[PDB]
Amino acid sequence: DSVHVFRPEFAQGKFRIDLDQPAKQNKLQQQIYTLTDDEREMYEDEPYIGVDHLYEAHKGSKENPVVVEAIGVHGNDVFTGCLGGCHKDAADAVAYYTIVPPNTLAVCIDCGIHFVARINEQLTFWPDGTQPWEKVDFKAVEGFLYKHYKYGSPLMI
Amino acid sequence: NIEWPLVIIYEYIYLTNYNIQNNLLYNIATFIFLEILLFIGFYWLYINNIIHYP
Amino acid sequence: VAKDKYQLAKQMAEFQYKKSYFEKPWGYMFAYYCDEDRARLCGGIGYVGHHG
Amino acid sequence: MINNIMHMINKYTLTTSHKIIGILYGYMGYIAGILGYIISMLIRMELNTQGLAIVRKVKEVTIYNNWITIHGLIMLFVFIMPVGIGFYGNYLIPMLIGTSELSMPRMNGISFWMLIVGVVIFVISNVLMSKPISSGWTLYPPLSTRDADNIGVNIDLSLLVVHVLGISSTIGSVNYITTNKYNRHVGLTFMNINIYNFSIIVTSILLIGSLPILGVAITGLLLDRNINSTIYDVIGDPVLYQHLFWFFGHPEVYVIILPVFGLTSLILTSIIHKDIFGREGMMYCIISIGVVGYFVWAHHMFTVGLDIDSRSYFSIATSIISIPTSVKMFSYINTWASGRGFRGNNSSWSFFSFLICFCFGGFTGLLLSSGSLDIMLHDTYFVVGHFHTVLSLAATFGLLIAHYFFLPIIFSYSIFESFSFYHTFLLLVGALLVFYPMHLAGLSGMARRVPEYADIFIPFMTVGFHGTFLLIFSTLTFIRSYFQFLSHINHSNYL
Amino acid sequence: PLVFDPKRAFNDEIFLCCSLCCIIFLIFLFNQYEEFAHELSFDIREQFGLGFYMLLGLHGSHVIFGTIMLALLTLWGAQGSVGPQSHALRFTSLYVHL
Amino acid sequence: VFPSITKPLGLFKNLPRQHRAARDASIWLAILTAGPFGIFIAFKYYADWYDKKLLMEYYKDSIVYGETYGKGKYV
Amino acid sequence: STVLSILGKRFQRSALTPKMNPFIRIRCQGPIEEFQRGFIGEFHAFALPGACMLVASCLGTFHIIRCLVVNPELSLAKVIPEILQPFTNPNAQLKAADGKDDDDSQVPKQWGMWG
Amino acid sequence: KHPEWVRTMRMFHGTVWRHRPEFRHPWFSRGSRASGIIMLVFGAVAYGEITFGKRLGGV
Amino acid sequence: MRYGNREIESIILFFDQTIILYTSIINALIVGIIIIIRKWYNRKGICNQYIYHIKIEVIWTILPIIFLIVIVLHSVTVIYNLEINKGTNNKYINVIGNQWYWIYNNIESRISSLGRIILVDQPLFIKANNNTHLIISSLDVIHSFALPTLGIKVDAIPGRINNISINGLTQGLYVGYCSELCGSGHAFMPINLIVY
Amino acid sequence: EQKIKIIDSEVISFLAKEILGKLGLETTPQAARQYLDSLVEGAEALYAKIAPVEP
């Protein structure tokens, strides 16, 4: 009988930010794949599920827009885009990019889709080992947020 | 060349994640490939007059 | 989507109002925007009139 | 102020930013191109005149040989790769895949300053030292090693320059591959990246595989010169040297050309307002040309005494590599149709000239592929005509498309279209008058790398004289146009 | 305070392995140097001699670089800075195997 | 175009459609390569056969090559 | 003036409802799978360029093997460890026709054609 | 009390934060810039000596 | 007008065949490009959707393949035709390439002052209609015995004895060159062959 | 041509038959189409009586 202690990973900073919240960071850096030629052929002949599409309001209506979220600085214009061909008359060869003000209703008049690109700033505790291990309250966070709004904070580069 | 280990240490402590690690490992692989090609070239140099028996 | 004919008449009246009061304004604003972009790129600054 | 001067120097010497390194690469590439053009003008003036008008001695033809060798090396390694790959590769590659910097940021600066040390050694050796290297850009032994006129340390410094240039290119290639593989924004698959990025990737794969062999060959030359070994002497195999060099050599030319294809495709998408016709086909043809280029190197050695079956094989392989280039040319021709390309654009007309001249050069080089027919065309002016109507009339015009496209984007001032039209048209006509006759001079039997020719070849060189004057006019127009680009008005009054 | 601990350093597996590998590499280098000087009759100025010596000299240079890497990894393992998933360890392992 | 050879032959029926299509692509790549090799090998062997025929019909009555080239033993 | 026609008003060219193409998730994708999705899966553009690549590679390999098999000068006698050497005859070309140079058609001539 | 733990926290809590790890060591940076200047001077001198044929040792 | 050889005649006819094919392709592309450009500059025939056509792409990649196999077959046959005369000779001539002059059977050929660059003081004599073997090599650097009018270009490399077969049918003097950079006097190192 | 997958078609058919029974119409799929087409028919007359809006 013996006791074993696995050697922990001591790295801080970007690594500890990644390991604190792996769902969000993975979402940020997880590659997703598009359909090949045979897969496009197999998808274009799949059926709709129910007759709802004949009655409901599609995703991308003036009342049900496509809301998307980027990270950055408050007020900075957001980079978004299509993969092409949201409409029959729109190009589909390659992805088409867009620069749009944040938190505003934009309309793509190529496809006709209304979208809400918006920014959420990734404000996180200074990762130097002083991060809190138990539930924290709104006071210290209130001070830090006030300082960030009034003056700004450094970038993790 | 002592600057490489110092910056390496201080960047691993602060700037590292799986994307960076994958980049570094792929670069290591390419460097190993280049060394293999160098050895292949030198073996070509050596065996040019030995395979030709006469 | 309108289902019976009364809903069709209601949506037709709404469409007529919207056309007179919300769609033609949009059309004319967009036409002006296109012409203004042409004017901005005209005068040797950009490639307006080279094709199209 | 000392602080301001040090800030500027540190800004341009400690940098690891892809945009800054890209503009540095572009500037160095343009300067090297101008130097090579000056040397080429000296060569042409030597050829255009009878009775050794410039060197005035048969004992002093080593000056002419130095000219040809340094012209070849400068124009190949220091002009077209720093501009085609270094300039737009660093500036654009991270931008098109939506990332901040290339992976290994420091290695980029290391690469650029390795290029700079190479240029410095080369210039100091071939300008400020007596009796430079005089053996052509293909430094064939025993001329390079065992020769009376090649004994000084200038030759060794030139060989070490080749080494440092190879090192810089390898570093750049590794960096490009790594950055493109892992640093794409979410939702962008590998084969949906911009076509220029794929061409850069395949060029990088080409450079990685072949440069170490060139390093081995050049070290063999150095050891023959210094350690007095017989690797390539009478008890050696100069043919071994040739095999190694050319195993590097042809991948080098495809490395030069492919990024021009990528840039042309990108700019076309931008200036015709329509996507590439058969983008998948063009990408697959690029990779196919890249891979096939590794199996053909000995088509430059049909007269050294190869085995007859090997000659047959190398002619076959050259035809195989011909195929995908034809596919690409057809794709370009169909891409331009049904577009709205600007009708008064130097980029559009440069694309026309690029396409035509590249098709002509490809056909002429396809004639050379046949082993038998290469008996009559090796080491004549037909080969010079070929690789100048490719390099100096297609690759150059691709870079002119890129130049007249990206200047308004890098500096934010439009382009003087009429001035640029004069430059481009005179460059086209002047070059066609210099290189085209070479073809018919090669068939008639004129040999290359000679300053004095028999009286039978007068008309070809008279047409070359005409072309050289037109080229001088065109390049002066180009440099003056760029100076005028960054200068404010000089006259203004009231009407 | 940060104080070097020889007890922990010697109770660590990475430190022992890298030191042993560095020692064996030095032994190999010394042995190979002993056969280049006082064993062979042909020099680098011959036909086979030159190619053979170029090959073995390149291999010896790579062995010297690998010895430097193993010494560096021994230094880092003594300090306890090398973890199981260390890319330094991966690089040294791959290089030595090559 | 390139229709899927495995569908009218019933091969790789246990695989998902994507991987079955990958096998079809591999088969077509194999076919396209064998064409030119077949053409050139056929031409080479025809050339060897014709050379044997010529050596038979020219050195039939020779006294030096009447038994080697004439008979085709070591053409 | 039929229900479908009304329900078809949002599915005509003029007022077609937009639809965004989707992604998919792949649990593990190495380079091989990338190829299987990048180059394979586009076998109308990749067909003949890939065929050219394969033909070049196969021709090079075949040339090398054929040379190592039939060329008289080449020999894996000093290239391969002694355990495999007894399968090599490096002087065969010098031993043909008992070494006597007096009768062509007794000395092999390794040419592709027209030997 | 693990040395790696102490080293990490010292990198964060025991030193003045420098944006450049090479600057985290002051004297080494001095030595490195001195080496750069030394290499520049050596290169200039070698170029001068090799071209002019006099090796500067006799003067 | 005579050819002076049959190897060279074969090379010339192969060259003519390739020229015919390439000029036909060039004319076809010229017509296509003329139509495209005439439509483009007048701002007619615009279509943004025309970015693909599967059958056209397959056809235009198939056509170059089938028209290049013929060329490759013809080239390979021409090579082997060049090399089949070996063994049917009765004269051996040794050529040594020295620094800016040739040596034929221990006789030095140097450029003369009677001709500008083309004549030498000692030609190389071979009988008409007589297969000969030239054993070519060099002593110091790489030269290239180049007589392309008889379809011959053999690199004379130090320490590498090349063997070529020569057979002239037209009597007269043929002028060739060194065709390989050998130094200062590379442009003044000609070759003269007398077929008598 | 649109392809639609009718989920829970048994429940859909049961509910449709009951709806058609309540309205006093035949409980057959053709009757459902006829009823839905009768719902939307006659809209032109209602269109014609719409008074125009002010400019």
Ligand code: HEA
């Ligand atoms: C990329 C390579 C490159 C480029 C651009 C050139 C450009 C030119 N070259 Fe040459 N050349 C070679 C590569 C190149 N060359 C090589 C490899 C050899 C063989 C060396 C050997 O034989 O040993 C050779 C040999 C060679 C000879 C050999 C003569 C002899 O062997 O008998 C001659 C003479 O006619 C010649 C002429 C020219 C001329 C007149 C130009 C140009 O003047 C014509 C076009 C001019 C341009 C304007 C291009 C210059 C561009 C700038 C102005 C920079 C600005 C940037 C851009 C425009 C984007 N070149």
Ligand code: HEA
């Ligand atoms: C970037 C520069 C570049 C490019 C793109 C090329 C492209 C090609 N090159 Fe060359 N080459 C050089 C640069 C280049 N080359 C240089 C610098 C030298 C000299 C080195 C030295 O000796 O100093 C050289 C030398 C050289 C030789 C040496 C001749 C001699 O030395 O004896 C040969 C012969 O095999 C050759 C062949 C080819 C071929 C077959 C192509 C092919 O890629 C071309 C294929 C293109 C096409 C064929 C056009 C498309 C055609 C159609 C539109 C359809 C028609 C199709 C059919 C009829 C089937 N090149």
Ligand SMILES: CCCCCCCCCCCCCCCCCC(=O)OC[C@H](COP(=O)(O)OCCN)OC(=O)CCCCCCCCCCCCCCCCC
């Ligand atoms: C990895 C690489 C390995 C190394 C490479 C190995 C070799 C590669 C490939 C080899 C095959 C190349 C092509 C072979 C065909 C040509 C040889 C042939 O078939 O020769 C037969 C014939 C000989 O006849 P001949 O002696 O002229 O006449 C006697 C009485 N009339 O020949 C002639 O008549 C010769 C005259 C014509 C020459 C031009 C080309 C002819 C090609 C086909 C000839 C036969 C026609 C059949 C095809 C139908 C065409 C419509």
Ligand SMILES: CCCCCCCC/C=C\CCCCCCCC(=O)OC[C@H](O)COP(=O)(O)OC[C@H](N)C(=O)O
């Ligand atoms: C499909 C995509 C493009 C294909 C390429 C087409 C482009 C045109 C270019 C080239 C055409 C095709 C390229 C492929 C080249 C085919 C030529 C080839 O290997 O001969 C095979 C060789 O003669 C056969 O010799 P074998 O070993 O049987 O016999 C010898 C000896 N007696 C022996 O002991 O065995």
Ligand SMILES: [Cu+2]
């Ligand atoms: Cu080539």
Ligand SMILES: [Cu+2]
């Ligand atoms: Cu000569």
Ligand SMILES: [Cu+2]
């Ligand atoms: Cu010469």
Ligand SMILES: [Mg+2]
């Ligand atoms: Mg040559």
Ligand SMILES: [Zn+2]
């Ligand atoms: Zn869209």
